[PDB]
Amino acid sequence: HYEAPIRKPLVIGDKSYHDVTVDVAAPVEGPANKQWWIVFTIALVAFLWGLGCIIYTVSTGIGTWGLNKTVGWAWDITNFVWWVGIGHAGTLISAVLLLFRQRWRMAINRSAEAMTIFSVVQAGLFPIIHMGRPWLAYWVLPIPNQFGSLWVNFNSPLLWDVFAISTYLSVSLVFWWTGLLPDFAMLRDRAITPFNKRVYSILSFGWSGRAKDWQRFEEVSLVLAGLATPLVLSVHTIVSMDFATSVIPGWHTTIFPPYFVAGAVFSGFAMVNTLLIVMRKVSNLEAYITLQHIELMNIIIMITGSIVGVAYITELFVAWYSGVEYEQYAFLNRATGPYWWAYWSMMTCNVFSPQFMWFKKLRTSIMFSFIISIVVNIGMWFERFVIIVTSLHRDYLPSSWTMFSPTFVDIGIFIGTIGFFFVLFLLYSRTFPVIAQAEVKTILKGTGDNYIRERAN
Amino acid sequence: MYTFSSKLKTFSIILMVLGLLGIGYGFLSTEHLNHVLHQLQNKPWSALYVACIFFLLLSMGVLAFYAIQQVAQAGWSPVLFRVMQGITAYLPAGSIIFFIILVLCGLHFNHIFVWLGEGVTDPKSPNYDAIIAGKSGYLNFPFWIVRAFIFLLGWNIYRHFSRKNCLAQDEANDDLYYKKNFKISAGFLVFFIVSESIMAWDWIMSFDPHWFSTLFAWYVFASFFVSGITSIALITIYLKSKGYLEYVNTSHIHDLAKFMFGISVFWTYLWFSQFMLIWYANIPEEVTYFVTRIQLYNLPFFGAVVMNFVFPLLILINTDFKRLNWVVVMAGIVILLGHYVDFFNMIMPGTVGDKWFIGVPEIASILFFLGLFIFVVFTALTKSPLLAKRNPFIEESKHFHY
């Protein structure tokens, strides 16, 4: 054909068509081990305890939280936007990499989708839990009623957020689900038990793979990828405008709509990378997730990290350039004040972590990159925390200046969402086809350590 | 090689004469008039400034893309690199002219910038402005010149060695120049991002020392990067129609068409978010920026939205149309005009305000630099063969289809 000799193989082990399907189907076709049950139990307990904390604070009062009369938001919306940021990784991997014809994405796409459907859901709890009277939440929708057709306004970003999140999730759900049709077909055709036979004959639709069916299938995925990238940007931007549209010094800005997005990409891939690292060893799919996939994840993280760095110095320049004392003081408060440790630990992580990737000896290391990928998520949690808290406890009228400290029920709810995340993801890995077969089988001949060697001789 | 048309020479000469003459013409024509007369005297000056910065950044919009395509190891771009190299020959000449203009401001031959005027910093003067004086640690003139100067070297050096090493790679039995350029381009892109942010502050936001905004430079970047892409496409269409390109087909055109489409939408995104975040919570300080634009430059302000969004929105969405030469040429022209207007809109209200118009001194500067640009680019194409030699990705690009 015409492939360049420069490129390295994406498939290792001289694997054929049966080799690939057997490898991927194997974890679905067998039983879970003791270690799986131990981990599962732990995640479940954390989740159930978290539910108890949620019920308690809903039924007894928000005053059980560490919120103040000054600081109305902290840890509730902090964790909301943190989970939202995480849930943009999969929609980049399956849509953006698609649009740029990035072949290596084929071994990631499926698990990347799991990362958004199990994290957007976590975020969806906070918009309800923090509410003062959540049983009246249905009033948010513009539904004809007995109050003289009393409506809602359409000027608040909190309402815009309702539309952004509910449609973001809805669209992504049908997108990744459609991609499962040819993979469930390969499981219903195993039918080792009549129970499983029934299950996969129902999970799959009548997907008898045919010329016409595949033709349409490809076109649908192209359209949805085209629509998905705009959603990735617009949804996180609507979230961003909860602070950008304010009158509060330190929040009012124009940099947030692209800034928070860059951060979302950065933190999302850092999360994904840690799960792929443990996945390729537990599931034994290291022949599909190679060091080239890991290296490329590291490179992207490096790139977006530098974008964030530029935005940090942009804000500081403008603050100095501006003659507004209130904006300058807000930045002085972050540099030196009672929350200095949140600010400086945040900056330490975001500034230096992505810069280690310039060194090949560090970038090409599953050990080093595993550690760094974890660190990034810590720094990004503080990124969200610092912006919200440091800008509220200090503002107009010195008499209103205060502090802030969270309680065990603020912490507990967050722990609960983490536990739930892992319950869902862990169960996913034992029932779903973790690697798309329809995708891999279109690249097995184009790339791999067999065919390339053939081309070279 | 590339045989010069033997007609474009005289064509570009005509543009460089009629435009030049029009420029010359433009400079031959209580406290109320102290305002008005400065607005009138600035008209033929900002008419040149906007033309130079437009074409200067136009060239930079190609080099940014060039560096990206090599770093990203594109498998369809190699066949078009010679054209891109030919286009980015303007920069080492256009940047000279632009720099000279900056010097002329420094030597007080105009009133283009406010903070470069006399008596602004000192408190012993009727021209004293405390707000501007407080920003003098950044606006200090000799710092502004040096800071501007080194940005030009940081772009011109890259251009020079990129070409030099490429030609060396064409005449070698191993690699070493490919990898050399790979490393250089990566370094360039890092530098570029930093110099881009500062550049916008110094050359565009410096027209209004009483106004600031975050997300300005990224907006500016998009406003020229998009136009850079369309200029690439238009040159390759021309050369192809004249029989000078081989291994070029509608899939290469299509790929560029959809590329420029997506990034033109991105420009619109940035435009709106900047506007709305001021409009939504109109804290009066920093709001007059839009007040004086909406009330005066009504059609320019909103027309720039339509031409850079609405028009291509209903054109470059049909994949069959993306392969048609006249569809692509048409859209390219509209986009270029739209971004010219974008720069016009950003600069004009700060120099002439309500005395603005699009007559002789504006048209003349456009045509002058148009002719200059054409002359340099097509001359450059005769100094090197199209379709580079041994290159690690050229064999697949010669068979590229989509």
Place this chain on the structure above:
Amino acid sequence: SNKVIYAIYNDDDVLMNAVKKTRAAHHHIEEVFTPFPVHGLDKAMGLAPTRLAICAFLYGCVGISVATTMMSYIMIHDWPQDIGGKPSFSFIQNMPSFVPIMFEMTVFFAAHLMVITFYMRSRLWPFKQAENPDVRTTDDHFLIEVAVNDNEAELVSFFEGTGAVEVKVIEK
């Protein structure tokens, strides 16, 4: 009482050769079944282009009419109250605050209405009976089926030439 020839292959290379030969020899192909996308099959078969993209664009246009008629009714023509200093006099005035919703609605309808169009035209739903003529085809083996007119002997001898891994003649 029609019979169908089931030509079972091994790779895309032999499919492309086989399909092109049936086109040259004028053997009407009834269906082609594959475990994964070929990226040259519909071209060789001569299948007509899809129109799903043409289906959505229109769905997006429906979405924008919904978003704008909703908000222009409620906010300025039913209760034109003041919420802040926002001018609710017209729809030009206070337009920017409606953009975040209008955008999301056009994508929402463009996406979901064409996905269900795909399922309706491809006949896919949760309790639909699967139509695999040979179980092995999903994991592996490619299948081209051609109906028998009357000359079973030569129709089979044709399929016994290129890519003849397994050839079956099955009634109905």
